[PDB]
Amino acid sequence: SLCALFLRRNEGEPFKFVKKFNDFFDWSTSVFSAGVAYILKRTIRFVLIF
């Protein structure tokens, strides 16, 4: 309810270090997605690590 009345849309000023850290974060998002996809195919070889 506090977002519907105060959350504006346009915001093209995400600074330098904030915009840099978010694109920094997107890299790990794909690496984690490919890492998960790596684990899902090599099944038993990661059950024993557990």
Add this chain to the structure above:
Amino acid sequence: AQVAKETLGDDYSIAWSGSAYQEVSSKGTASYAFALGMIFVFLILAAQYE
């Protein structure tokens, strides 16, 4: 209390008892109860009238 601080000695404790001690004991409560009462009144109505 004021006049006994004046006409007494360096060894006489102006002690208190009876009802005059129940009134001297403490203060600072008669207000911060009415205040929060009004705040709860205002919020109870502000939630009703929207």
Add this chain to the structure above:
Amino acid sequence: MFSKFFIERPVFASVVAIIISLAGAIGLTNLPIEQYPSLTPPTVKVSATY
């Protein structure tokens, strides 16, 4: 159903927040201040002389 209730009525949702926050602050005022939850065993002293 449940969340849409409060989104349509922001003043109501905010009042519930302040009520919890204020009445909780009332609890903060009237709370004992120890260091541990009475983790020390209570003792009883029996003294006699011969």
